[PDB]
Amino acid sequence: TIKVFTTVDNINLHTQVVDMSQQFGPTYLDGADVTKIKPHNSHEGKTFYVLPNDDTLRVEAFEYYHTTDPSFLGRYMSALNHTKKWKYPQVNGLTSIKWADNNCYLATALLTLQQIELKFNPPALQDAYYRARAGEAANFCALILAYCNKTVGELGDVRETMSYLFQHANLDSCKRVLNVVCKTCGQQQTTLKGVEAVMYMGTLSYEQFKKGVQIPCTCGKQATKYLVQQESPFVMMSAPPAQYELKHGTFTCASEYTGNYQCGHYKHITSKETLYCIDGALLTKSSEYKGPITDVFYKENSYTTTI
Amino acid sequence: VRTIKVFTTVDNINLHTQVVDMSMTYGQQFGPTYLDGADVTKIKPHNSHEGKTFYVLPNDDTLRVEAFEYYHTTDPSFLGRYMSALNHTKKWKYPQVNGLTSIKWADNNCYLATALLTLQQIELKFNPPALQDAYYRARAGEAANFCALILAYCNKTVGELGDVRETMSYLFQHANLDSCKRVLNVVCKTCGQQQTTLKGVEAVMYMGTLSYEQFKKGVQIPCTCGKQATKYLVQQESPFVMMSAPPAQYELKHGTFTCASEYTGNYQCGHYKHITSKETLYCIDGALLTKSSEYKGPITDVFYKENSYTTTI
Ligand SMILES: [Zn+2]
Ligand SMILES: [Zn+2]
């Protein structure tokens, strides 16, 4: 006989004596598949992830991961088997990722996540972000890939990754109020709540968003849309990549993207004592920056416009 | 102690007789239950339900097996979104506009309408039996379950603002485009020359330009040299190709393309329309049909039909 632990969370462990001769469901050990394995007595006392196969386990996995998808732990453990072999360099006080399996977009998001103020809802994300800040970001990246339905090696979007993670963050109290003025359609005001309130695609400049941007109305003409009010701990401004000048102290972080929609390399720029650009494990300093930026992140508390 | 005998299913192909007590709801006995799209999970069985077929989420091995054989998914929340959307899409109207099945406007269904019209003009063979069944009934004028499946496959709900390119992107993964091939060549005068071969869904989709002709001549793309490089189409093997770009003004010429997605607005909120090249250029906006000899407007997807192409450069 062998006495081992089964879990879905790795926080609530079920004592479950296993016989020497699967027999508990598809199971894993430290990220590795143990479906084929008969218990070695090297496993006495070890904990094994078991894909939920009961009501008690299934409600445990939901209170931790906030999802009922049975495929979640399978894609998580499969990503975790790769992410736990990644290197997480300490760059400029932040936890990064050394390049591997086209993880450039995942590293840029991870550096951004450590610089804006988010409160995650699922315990799995709360636990792993603090593990990531402690220097071991393997659980966090594996969960991010699982939540965005992506596999290791696959290419992704920084903006689209943040969008997925914002769905699992308590941004319910964040509010945005917009006014669009078309000259032949009038003046109309819109209120956005939740994730839609902190995300915009169309311009990188938070100042021009405040002063009003030109957008197509349904009349076909150019209409002016401007920010009336913003209640948020941050705002993410995005636009298709194009040359852009980042000025020190006027933003939090930024995503630089060289390439096109089919293939490109992400980089991360952050504003500290000067401009730091973090590639993977590489760091370059600069007082001025100008390059192809596609995301800029700003700090915010509460804003009301003058127009 | 009254009972009635109903039938449960996840595909309406395999039907499992179930005696259920009228003392308790369908939820306490099956989990989430649906009758013709209506959520009856907290309703206790009437006498009017006997003999009828209900939909429920997978709770057993064969219940999970049947759901995957049909929909090619094991997420039990799929049918919860599938039938909840069919509860709306069955009350939409599906008129025949210019020989195609369209959708009258409702709950921001323009992106589905434009997608639906596009699916009927390109050659698509779907993998999940649910899609191939609903797609044939969609061409017949009953797209209620085809669009319900599309929204569930795209993780989108009725009333949600949508994107046509994303929609086709999701449906393309559920289609057999295995035999589709694309070969591209990139040259930067500082990085050098390199060739790549893409298969399947990535072989029929490109984001960057609307002109299939320009793709063949070559488009200017950034290399991480810092310099601009030229990427051009070396070889294409597909029944169609979908070219996409951020919305901009564009001239559509009769007979040079199959169909096109018109988007007026911005990323946050805009309006889709469908342009199709027939004997002249027709615009389809839900149930509304207009036409013009030439066309200029904001276009974001252009579909071309293809056989096989090999370049001369
Ligand atoms: Zn207007
Ligand atoms: Zn180059």
Author numbering:
A (entry chain C): 4 to 24, 29 to 314
B (entry chain A): 2 to 314
What does the paper say about this structure?
As a result, compound 2 is designed and synthesized based on the fusion of VIR251 and compound 1. To gain insights into the precise ligand binding mode, a crystal structure of SARS-CoV-2 PLpro in complex with compound 2 was determined at 2.5 Å resolution. As expected, the contiguous electron density is clearly shown between C111 and the P1 group of compound 2, demonstrating the covalent bond formed between the protease and 2. In addition, the P1–P3 groups of compound 2 form multiple hydrogen bonds (H-bonds) with the main chain of N109, G163, Y268, and G271 as well as the side chain of Y264. The superimposed crystal structures of SARS-CoV-2 PLpro in complex with compound 2 and VIR251 reveal that the protein-ligand interaction patterns of the P1–P3 groups of two inhibitors are highly conserved. The superimposition of crystal structures of SARS-CoV-2 PLpro bound with compounds 1 and 2 reveals that the P4 group of the two compounds employs a highly similar binding pose in the complexes. Therefore, in the SARS-CoV-2 PLpro-2 complex, two fragments individually adopted from VIR251 and compound 1, bind to the pocket as we desired, highlighting the elegance and utility of the structure-based drug design in significantly facilitating the development of new inhibitors. The resulting IC50 value of compound 2 is 0.46 μM, which is about 100-fold and 5-fold improvement in potency compared to that of VIR251 and compound 1, respectively.
The papain-like protease (PLpro) of severe acute respiratory syndrome coronavirus 2 (SARS-CoV-2) plays a critical role in the proteolytic processing of viral polyproteins and the dysregulation of the host immune response, providing a promising therapeutic target. Both of them are required to cleave two viral polyproteins (pp1a and pp1ab) to generate 16 mature nonstructural proteins for genome transcription and replication. In addition, SARS-CoV-2 PLpro recognizes and cleaves the C-terminal LxGG sequence of ubiquitin (Ub) and ubiquitin-like proteins (UbLs) such as interferon-stimulated gene product 15 (ISG15) to remove the Ub and UbL modifications from host proteins, respectively. The deubiquitinase (DUB) activity of SARS-CoV-2 PLpro is thought to induce dysregulation in the host immune response against viral infection and replication.
